[PDB]
Design a protein around this nucleic acid. Structure first.
Lengths: 174, 174
DNA sequence: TGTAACGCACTGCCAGCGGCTCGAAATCTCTCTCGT
DNA sequence: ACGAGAGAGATGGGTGCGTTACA
């Protein structure tokens, strides 16, 4: 278990210490393409895990980034790993804290943040509401029939207002 | 053999009693998606078999519907059975009668109905007409040089008229 | 005119490198448990 | 509401004939 302040710290320590192994090449992860999500982004007092979203530019990389992820100077086991979700246990200041990692591509970014910020109940209200208008929403995008609806948006705020919903900051989503 | 009357009785009996097994689930076939075809849709006095065209929504389901087909409370053996055609022998009022089932995916429905309605001598006239115009028509769609000619059509009638042919009632095709 | 189910011969190509079996080795689905 | 990872369960060589059978 953690506190908000500690989690923010850990998030700061990792922005600049991220890289994955690709054809024997250790490629850096720009902090520009790392977004914190989960109970942390919803400025909660007490945490459980830390969740970060990693943005991947090129489709072909997905198989390489999460399974072969590297962190400078930190001890970390691994519980499960896929291309899209990863669960690590790290040691920080001599203690064990769960860390969760996720992955989205450029045009998935707004949908991805909005999905992973949450919280659940808020997602559930939203997705149900658009289900009654024949849409499906997920972390990938908006879909009407099979075909994914292309939306002229770029930011999460932009996306929410496009989905015709009051925009609230993350710590007021229920 | 069967009287047309006995045939209508059977189809009607069957409409609300068709289901298949799919992952240990017994899935009800909607009478909405059960078309009667062959000699019975052509309203012949004397029938030899009973022909049922079943409409399957999701292509993935073809390998489950027909091979795991069940009929609530009616004896039947199975002569042959595959994904697309399946041949039964049922006990009805202490007599053995042959029942055929065929399948069609939603977007084939017009061609299928048209196909299975028959009769053969009619289809030949028709297919041979579209052949000399470099087409092939079959239960699955219309083709030109191995390429599916898409048509915005949704009924057997629309299809026939789109094909440029005088619509005849099923009982008047020869 | 146009297609399906099925049993089969002839291979082709892996588990088996000789067999055309049973059931290996690798790949699928589904089911479960998990996330937000 | 809508997806993921990881086991479990299940498949079991491709062709292409020829024959019977469907409208």
């Amino acid at each position: 278990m953690l506190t908000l302040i500690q989690g923010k710290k850990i998030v700061n320590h990792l922005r600049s210490r991220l890289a994955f192994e690709y054809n024997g090449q250790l490629i850096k992860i720009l902090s520009k393409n790392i977004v914190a999500v989960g109970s942390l982004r919803r400025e909660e007092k007490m945490l459980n895990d830390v969740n970060l979203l990693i943005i991947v530019p090129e489709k072909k990389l997905l198989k390489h980034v999460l399974p072969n992820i590297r962190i400078k100077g930190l001890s970390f086991s691994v519980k499960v790993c896929g291309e899209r979700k990863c669960v690590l246990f790290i040691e920080w200041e001599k203690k064990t804290y769960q860390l969760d990692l996720f992955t989205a591509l450029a045009e998935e970014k707004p949908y991805a943040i909005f999905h992973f910020t949450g919280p659940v109940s808020y997602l559930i209200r939203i997705r149900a509401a658009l289900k009654k208008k024949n849409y499906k929403l997920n972390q990938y995008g908006l879909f009407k029939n099979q075909t994914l609806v292309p939306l002229k948006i770029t930011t999460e705020k932009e996306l929410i207002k496009e989905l015709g919903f009051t925009y609230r900051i993350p710590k007021k989503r229920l």
